[PDB]
Symmetry: C3
Subunit: 494 residues, 3 copies
C-alpha cells in the first residue's frame, strides 16, 4: 500500500451528568461539580470561634442575674447559643423594646460588671420575694437593687455618677408596677411614683401603672426594665420619688465581631468557620442551601437545591454502529470511549498496524483554563457577624413586614445571579474545549502542505507511504513535507 489515514478526536465516557446552558435546559458533559452545599453534620464545632451554650438561660436572664444563671457571671463569647427548652424562674418582667436591648448586648460580647459606690440615703436596700428563691431564703436578680421605705418615709432620691474613664458605661435599671392602690402605699409612702434618668444630652421619665394581671409564680405585679448609655466626659443623674429598681454597677461595652443564634444542635470537638442553626457546614462551595441564618465566613444562600458547573467537554457516546474495519472515525462523527491517557489524541492506520496515542500540549491547556474558571468561582470573602433577625414568633406589623421584604429581595437577587453565572460559565466551557479541538486540526493541516488532503470524517488521507516514525514526526511537530512532496504530488494528481 502507498497511502495512510490519520484521524483526530476527543475522549468519551460511559456515564455522564446533565448541565444547564444559555440556550437549552439539559446537555451531557463528561464530568461536572456541585456548587450548592445541601447537608450538615448536625453539631456545632467549638473551634475556632468561642461558643457559649446557654442551657436553660436566655441572654436577658443571664444579664439580670437570675439564680439558675449564676454560672454566666463575667462571661465572654463570639457566638452565644440560646436553647428552646429555656425558661425563667424569678420575678415576672417585661422589657419595652426587648429586641433592641437583646441585639445591643449580643454585639458587645461580654458580661463584665464593675460594682460602683452608689449612696442610697434614708431607704432600706436588698428587697426580696419567694418568686425568686436563692437557696431556702427569698432572693432577687443579682445585678439590681429593690429599694423600699425606711420606717414611715421614702425621701426624694437624688444621686449622680460621673464617667472620667475613656470607655462607654451601660447602666440597666427598672420600675415596679404594683397590683393595687393598697400595695403602692405599703411599699412606697406616696400614692404615685416617678423615675427620671438623664445625661447632659438625653432624658427619660417613666410613671408606674397599677391594676391586676394574670398570676405567674404567685404574683399579679410586674417589673419594667430600661437602660442608659453614658459616654466618656458625660455624667449620669437618677431622681426618683418612688418605685425605683436601682442599679448596683455598670457593664463595660466593646465593639467587635460577637452575635447570638437560637439553635437546638449539640456542641462537639472539631474545626469549622461557618455555623448555622442546623449545625456547622463546610465553606469550599460558593453557594449554600441549608439555612438563611448564618455566622462567620459562609457561602451565599440561594433558593436552588442543585447547580452543576461543567468541568469537562460534551459527551457524544460512541457509534458502536461501525464498519467491518470499524474504519478509524474522528470527532466530526462521535467520541472515543477507548482512550484513557488524555482528552485529545490521534489514531493511525498504517501497513505496520492500527495504533493510538494522546496529546499533552492540548490536554494540559484545556485543563488549565477550566481549573482557572473553578478558582475565580469557588472561593472568596463572605465574612459576616451581626445582622437583622430573619425569623419571628409573634405578629408586630410594619417594621417586621419591612424586615421580611428586605430579606426576600436579597434572596431573589442572589438566586438570579447564581443561575446566570452557571449558564454563562457552562457555555464558555463547551466553547473553549471545542475551539481547542479545531486548533489541533489546523496545526496538523498547516504542517501537511500538499502531501495530505482532508476527507471530512475528521481524517487526513496522506498520499505517500507513512511508517510509524513518520506518524510520530507529525504527532511530534517536526514533520518535513519536502522529503515526500514529489512522490505525494505524483500519487494524488496523476
Amino acid at each position: 500500500n502507498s497511502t495512510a489515514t490519520l484521524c483526530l478526536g476527543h475522549h468519551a465516557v460511559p456515564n455522564g451528568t446533565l448541565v444547564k446552558t444559555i440556550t437549552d435546559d439539559q446537555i451531557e458533559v463528561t464530568n461536572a461539580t456541585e456548587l450548592v452545599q445541601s447537608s450538615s453534620t448536625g453539631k456545632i464545632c467549638n473551634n475556632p470561634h468561642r461558643i457559649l451554650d446557654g442551657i436553660d438561660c436566655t441572654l436577658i436572664d443571664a444579664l439580670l442575674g437570675d439564680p439558675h444563671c449564676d454560672v454566666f457571671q463575667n462571661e465572654t463569647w463570639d457566638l452565644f447559643v440560646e436553647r428552646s427548652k429555656a425558661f425563667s424562674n424569678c420575678y415576672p418582667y417585661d422589657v419595652p423594646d426587648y429586641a433592641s436591648l437583646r441585639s445591643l448586648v449580643a454585639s458587645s460580647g461580654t458580661l463584665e460588671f464593675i460594682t460602683e459606690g452608689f449612696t442610697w440615703t434614708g431607704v432600706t436596700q436588698n428587697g426580696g420575694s419567694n418568686a425568686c428563691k436563692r437557696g431556702p431564703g427569698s432572693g432577687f436578680f443579682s445585678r439590681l437593687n429593690w429599694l423600699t421605705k425606711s420606717g414611715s418615709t421614702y425621701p426624694v432620691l437624688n444621686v449622680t455618677m460621673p464617667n472620667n474613664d475613656n470607655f462607654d458605661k451601660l447602666y440597666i435599671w427598672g420600675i415596679h408596677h404594683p397590683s393595687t392602690n393598697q400595695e403602692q402605699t405599703s411599699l412606697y409612702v406616696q400614692a404615685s411614683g416617678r423615675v427620671t434618668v438623664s445625661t447632659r444630652r438625653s432624658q427619660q421619665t417613666i410613671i408606674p401603672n397599677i391594676g391586676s394581671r394574670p398570676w405567674v409564680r404567685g404574683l399579679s405585679s410586674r417589673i419594667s426594665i430600661y437602660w442608659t448609655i453614658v459616654k466618656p466626659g458625660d455624667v449620669l443623674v437618677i431622681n426618683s420619688n418612688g418605685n425605683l429598681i436601682a442599679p448596683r454597677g455598670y457593664f463595660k461595652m466593646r465593639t467587635g465581631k460577637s452575635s447570638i443564634m437560637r439553635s437546638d444542635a449539640p456542641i462537639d470537638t472539631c474545626i469549622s468557620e461557618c455555623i448555622t442553626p442546623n449545625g456547622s457546614i463546610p465553606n469550599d462551595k460558593p453557594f449554600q442551601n441549608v439555612n438563611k441564618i448564618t455566622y462567620g465566613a459562609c457561602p451565599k444562600y440561594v433558593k436552588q437545591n442543585t447547580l452543576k458547573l461543567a468541568t469537562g467537554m460534551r459527551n457524544v457516546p460512541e457509534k458502536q454502529t461501525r464498519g467491518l474495519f470499524g474504519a478509524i472515525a474522528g470527532f466530526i462523527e462521535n467520541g472515543w470511549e477507548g482512550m484513557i491517557d488524555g482528552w485529545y489524541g490521534f489514531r493511525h492506520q498504517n501497513s505496520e498496524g492500527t495504533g493510538q496515542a494522546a496529546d499533552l500540549k492540548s490536554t494540559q491547556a484545556a485543563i488549565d483554563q477550566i481549573n482557572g474558571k473553578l478558582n475565580r468561582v469557588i472561593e472568596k470573602t463572605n465574612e459576616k457577624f451581626h445582622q437583622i433577625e430573619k425569623e419571628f414568633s409573634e405578629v408586630e406589623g410594619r417594621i417586621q413586614d419591612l424586615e421580611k421584604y428586605v430579606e426576600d429581595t436579597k434572596i431573589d437577587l442572589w438566586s438570579y445571579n447564581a443561575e446566570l453565572l452557571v449558564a454563562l460559565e457552562n457555555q464558555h466551557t463547551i466553547d473553549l474545549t471545542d475551539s481547542e479541538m479545531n486548533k489541533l486540526f489546523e496545526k496538523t493541516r498547516r504542517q501537511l502542505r500538499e502531501n495530505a488532503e482532508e476527507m471530512g470524517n475528521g481524517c487526513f488521507k496522506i498520499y505517500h507511504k507513512c511508517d510509524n516514525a513518520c506518524i510520530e514526526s507529525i504527532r511530534n511537530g517536526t514533520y518535513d513535507h519536502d522529503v515526500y512532496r514529489d512522490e505525494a504530488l505524483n500519487n494524488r494528481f496523476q
Copy 2:
C-alpha cells in the same frame, strides 16, 4: 458550457426593527419581540382570585362595624379593593399605628366574629350618639360596647377570658377622650380614667387626654382604638376604672395569601392572575412597566418602556445594484429578498436554467435554539401576595424614607439586570445565526474535494458539467466526487 456556479445565502426582508447589543446602540434584525408589557384593559377581572369591592367603606370602618358598612359582616377575600370616594359617618376616631393594624387585618383575610359572654357588672351598656344614626335612632359601631355609670357609680371593672382553643384570638378595644372636665365627671364618676389590658407575657396601659378639638359631625371628643393578640394556652385580663370602650367578642385569624390595594378601576367578568391599580395585565412577558404595585403572579417592574429581543438574523437589505445577469450573488455580499420557503438556501446557475431552493436541516436548528432562548427568558415564578406600602399621602420622616430607599434600590438593580440580559442574548443570537451559515459552507466545501473551487463571492466554481440531478445531489448530501474527478482536474489545472 463545461462549468457551473453554486452560491449560498440567507433570507432578507423589506422592513426591519432595530435592537440593542453589547457594542452598539442600534442594529437591524429580520424580526424581534417585545419583553415589556406597556398597556392595561383598565378593569379588574373577578377570576381566579376572590375580589371584595369596598364601595364607600375603608377596611378599618368595615371591621369596627360603621352603619353604612353592615353588608361586610363575616366577609372573606384574597384581595380587598378600597375606593378614593370612601368616607366615615360615625363617631370621629384615630388609631395610633393605624398602618400596622391595617396591614395585620389585610393579611388575615376574614372578618369572622364570635360573640363571647363578657360580664360587665354595675354599669350601663350600649351607649349611643347622633353622630352615628342607625335608622332614626342614635347608634354606634356594631362590634364595640360603650359603657357608662349606672346610678351614681362606675365600679373598678375586673374581667378575664381564657383561650382553651387551638387558634389565635384578636381583641379590638378602645378609650374615650372627653372635651371638658365637666363631661368626664358626667359620663364616669371619677376625674381621671385608666385602662390596663394584659396577658401572661405582655401589658399596655393608656390614660385619657381632655381638651378641645375641631368639630367633626357635631362633636369635639374622639375615640382611640387599641388591640391585643392572645395565643393558645394564654389568658386575657381587662382592668379599667373609667373611659373603657369594651370588646363584644374576638375575631379569628388565619395565615394565607390575602392583601389590600387602593384602586379606582371598575370590576368585570374575565380570567387574569396579575392585578395592578390600573387594572389586570397579562403575564406572558417577563418584565412590566405599568405600576410598581402588584398582586399575584406578575412580571418584574423596570424603568424602561421598551426592550426588544432579536428572534431573527441581521438584515443586509439587497444590492439591487446588480449586473446585466444579476450574476447570482451570495452572503458575503448581501441578503436575498426573493426567498420565502426558508432562512438558509441555495441558488444554482446551470445550462438547464437559473433556479432556487431552501434548506430544512439548518433552518430548523437555528429556529430550535432561538425558540429555546425565548423559553428560558419569558416565563417563571414571580408569585407574591403581601408586601410593603410604596405610595404615601403624608410626611412621616425616618421609616417612610427607608421604605422609599428600599424600593428604589430594588428597581435600579432589576432594571440593570433587564438591560444586560437583552444585550447578552441579542449578541449570542446574531453569533449563532452567522456560525450556522458558515457551517453549511464548510460542509459543502468538504463534499466537493478537488472538483470545485471557491471564488470569494460566497460561490463555488465547479470545473465539471453539473446538471439539475448533480446540483440536487450536492444540496441533498449524496454528492460522489470520484465520478467527475478526472474531468474536473483536467479542466481546472490544464
Copy 3:
C-alpha cells in the same frame, strides 16, 4: 528570484498593563483605562448647586433662631453643610425623633417664616433667660414665644388657626420641664401642665416631667420640641393649661431636590455636579471609591480600588530571538514593535527590497467597536438627592441595624455587578480584536486563488514574480489572479 513572501501581523508595545478576564486573573494588553475614581481635590465647588455653609450652627439651631444663627433667616439651599466645630449657646433642649425632624426640614430646602396673628389672652409673653444673651440683656429663640402667668393666674388657653391657602403649613411648638415642684408653681399657677395640639384628623398630648438634671449653662431645666403639619382645608387648635412654648408663625414647605451633609472641607469657586464629604469629585467614570455618602449626579460606590477595562489587544512582546535575515515573521509567532502608523499591517520581502505599511479599513473598525463599548459603559444617569443616613454616632438598636444591613446589601450587589461587567467586556474585547486579525487573512487568501500558498508562519509564499506594484495591488484589494496564474501553476506544481 521568481517568488515572494507576504506576512500579516498586529502592533506590539514595550510596556503594558495587566487586566482581569473570565478564565485568568492577569493578562497583558497594549492599553487600558481606569473605571474607578480614587481621588478628590478636597474642596466643595459652589456651582451649579447652591451651597449654604453653616459655620457654628446646626440646621436645628438655625430653625429655632439661636442668637449666633441670625444670619440664616429666610435662607434657601440645594445642599446645607454642617461643620464638626458647631455648638449651641441658648436654653438647653432635646427633640424626641430628632432624626425625623432634621430629615423633613432638609428636604424642604427653605426657612421662609410668616408671622401670624395669634391672640394669647390673660398671659405675659416674651419670657427670657441669661442662658441665651442677645446683647447684654437676656433673650430666647427668635421663632418661639415663652408664655408665663399674668398677675396670679394662667387661664386655660384655647386658640384656632385655619389654613385657607393652597399649600402646607409647618408649626413648631414645645413644652418646658421645670426642675422642682416650687418652680412649676412660680411660673404656672397650676401644679401639673398639659398641652394638646390637634387637627380634624390627628391629635398629640404631652405632660411635663419634673426633677433634677445635670447643669448646662447654669440651668437644671430643659425644653422639648414638637411639630404639626396642617394641610389645605384643615384647621389647627391649641389647648394648654400650663407650660406651653407657643408658636409665633408657620414655615412654608416645598417638595424639591434639597438635602443636608456633615463635612469639614473648605468651599471654593469652580464647577462640579457630584459632592462628597471629602470634597467634589468628577463624574466621567461609572464607579467611585471615595465615600458611600453622595449628592447630585455621581458614580456608583463599590468596594474595589481598581478596575481596568482593556482598550487594546493582547501584547506578545517580540522574539528578538530572530534569524540572520530576521526573516519577516507574522502574528502566529509574535507582535511587531516597529509599527507606529496603525494596529494591523503588512510586511513584504521582494527583489526590490524589504518594506512595511499599515491597514486603515481594519484598524478603523476595531477602534470603532472598542469606542462603542466605552460609551455604553462610562456615562449614564445616577442622579440622586435625599437618602437615608449611612453613619451613626450613638447605639440605638433595631432601626439602625436595619439601615446598616440595607446599605451593605446594596454595596455587595453593585460590587459583584462591577466585577463581572469588566471581566465580560475584557473577554469580548480580546475576542473581537483576534477575529478582526483572522478576517484580513481569509480576505487575502480568497484573493490569491492558486497563485499563492500558506506556510504557517502567518505568511503567503507567492509562486510568481511580485514587484512593489503587485504587492500594492494585493494590499489595495484589486489583485487580478488571472494575469500570473499559468506562470505560478507551472512554478509550484512542476
